[PDB]
């Protein structure tokens, strides 16, 4: 693994999208993408809409699992083995998937009022789980595909809970899913003095508490956390909601938990005033606590009140999910795709970076290209480090966003 800053481009990205089920010719919008990679297997999902991306005729949602294997060029590609299609695509929301023992468990919210975040008060929590066999037996039974409505959810003080991230971890026989809890702001306890406005000239003291909701007058606040699911127990599945600690809290946002080099790491999206990247090793899981890195070089296009590089508390709900994965812990180098625009989603760039320095990076598209959601998972293949990134990209020909998958080999040698 290279650890030296350079401006010569040593990163050559390769397009692996062609193995997965994405049809460029149809003109369909491919949104709500999900990528998870663990132990040489992968889980992928998307929603395919006819027409406008944000409001279009929902056509099909797919959830699939397969093996991540070398194409034969020594470049990894994704090959599905099992694919599941819900009968009613409009209902399934916010899938999140975790791997255990030759099954891969993906946890969804069911909604008849649309996206639960946006129609929060009207939604009654319905969670369901789909497990797909990564290596399917023939006519075995429930093993190749099993669907489950989840009846018992332990959410404590929280009024409703829902999975709210792409991928999750396993510890032993216990699965942890990234999730979010809706708590009525009357119940929310926050001492406004905590909110740091010291060098923020324009920011009022209460802004942080107000920013816990989508609106200053929002009925709920959003707290990130995990849903814990113990396979060792019997009977009806029980899901327990673990809340994140208040160290450096922001609005509950799409978040990802993953094991790298033995230990778990956590990434939470910045949809609030703090635009700086939030990721770190986790001290403890059941009393969830993360050691956020004090990163000062990577941020998120902010679209107005909370623009990139903002550190001052303001009331805003805006941003995009752009995550990174940790290739080396001793130097804490991490790899991820970010968008180099202060106010707009554009210019996606893949980078290998440290807390205060960007070692080396390569752009994935032309300067005009619009991009939105980026998901990055790294793994080690044939004793070499590879990173897969999924990038939502915009096609001028159809005013539609479709996903693109790149494989990038982290280079051991900086010179070439």
């Amino acid at each position, epitope marked *: 693994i290279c650890l030296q800053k350079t401006t010569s481009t040593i990163l050559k990205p390769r397009l692996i999208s062609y193995t997965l089920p994405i049809n460029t*010719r*149809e003109g369909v919008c491919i949104t709500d993408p999900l990528l998870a990679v663990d132990n040489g297997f992968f889980a992928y999902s998307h929603l395919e809409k*006819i027409g406008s991306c*944000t*409001r279009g005729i929902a056509k099909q949602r797919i959830i699939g699992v397969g093996e991540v294997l070398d194409r034969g060029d020594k470049v990894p590609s994704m090959f599905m083995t099992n694919v599941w299609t819900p009968p009613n695509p409009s209902t399934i929301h916010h899938c999140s998937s975790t791997y255990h023992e030759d099954f891969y468990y993906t946890l969804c919210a069911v909604s008849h009022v649309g996206d639960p975040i946006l129609n929060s008060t009207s939604w009654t929590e319905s969670l369901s789980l789909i497990r797909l066999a990564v290596r399917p037996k023939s006519d075995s039974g429930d093993y190749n595909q099993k669907y489950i409505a989840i009846t018992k959810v332990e959410r404590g003080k929280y009024d409703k809970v829902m999975p709210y991230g792409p991928s999750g971890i396993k510890q032993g026989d216990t699965l942890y899913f990234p999730a979010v809890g809706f708590l009525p702001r009357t119940e929310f306890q926050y001492n406004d003095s905590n909110c740091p406005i010291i060098h923020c000239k324009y920011s009022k003291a209460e802004n942080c508490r107000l920013s816990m909701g989508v609106n200053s007058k929002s009925h709920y606040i959003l707290r990130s956390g995990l849903l814990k699911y113990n396979l060792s127990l019997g009977g009806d599945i029980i899901l327990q909601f673990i809340e994140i600690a208040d160290n450096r809290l922001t609005i509950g946002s799409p978040s990802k938990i993953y094991n790298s080099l033995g230990q778990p790491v956590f990434y939470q999206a910045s949809y609030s005033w703090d635009t700086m990247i939030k990721l770190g090793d986790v001290d403890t899981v059941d009393p969830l606590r993360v050691q956020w890195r004090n990163n000062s070089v990577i941020s998120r296009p902010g*679209q107005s009140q909370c623009p990139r590089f903002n550190v001052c508390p303001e009331v805003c709900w*805006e941003g995009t999910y752009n995550d990174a994965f940790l290739i080396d812990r001793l130097n804490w180098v991490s790899a991820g795709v970010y968008l180099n625009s202060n106010q707009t989603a554009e210019n996606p760039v893949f980078a290998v970076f440290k807390d205060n320095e960007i070692l080396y990076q390569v752009p994935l598209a032309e300067d005009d290209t*619009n991009a939105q959601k980026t998901i990055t998972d790294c793994f080690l293949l044939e004793n070499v480090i590879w990173c897969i990134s999924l990038v939502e990209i915009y096609d001028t020909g159809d005013n539609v966003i479709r996903p693109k998958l790149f494989a990038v080999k982290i280079p051991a040698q900086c010179s070439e």
Partner: antibody
Amino acid sequence: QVQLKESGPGLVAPSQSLSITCTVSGFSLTSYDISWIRQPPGKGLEWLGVIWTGGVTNYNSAFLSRLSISKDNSKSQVFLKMNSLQTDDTAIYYCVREGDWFFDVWGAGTTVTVSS
Amino acid sequence: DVLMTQTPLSLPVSLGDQASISCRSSQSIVHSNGNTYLEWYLQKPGQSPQLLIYKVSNRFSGVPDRFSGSGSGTDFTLKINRVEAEDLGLYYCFQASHVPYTFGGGTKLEIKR
């Protein structure tokens, strides 16, 4: 229920910037895309641009050099900025809620005159 | 960059009659999805435009059944039979199929009396 209101300067000096703010009521900007459309004195409606919920913005290539659209989901507002505004540009500017690539709800309109 | 051209610049018509407006597109207006995204908008005097027809022939909600749209290739026609007084103003056709979004010149409907 649903409404779109534009506040505009009314008068803009030549070769100077135009700023219009659209305040939306009755829905969230996170769940609908928003377009800016203008109609000059006798000329047909002309499509200026669109901002998606995610923040994706696409513009009419004609105006790309001097036009930019942003939004504030928390304040339910959408912003149009235009640079180097000239005589040609005097018109009625409409804030418009998009559906499936059509315009279901139109703002009242703001009338912008470019004169010294 | 797709030109929309409306054929009758004024259409005068008496109540109870049928009015036909035509829209012609410089190039093919069919999307990759295969839907054709051609819409018809009415701007009544002293008012903002209102959508009438979407996807060539579908009537936007609240639009009475006498409004009818149809098209083939690059030729589209909107027909208002049983014209009423309310129905006067500017009629526009528009395309969302291609990225520059382009509108028609306009057609002013005039009611004979």
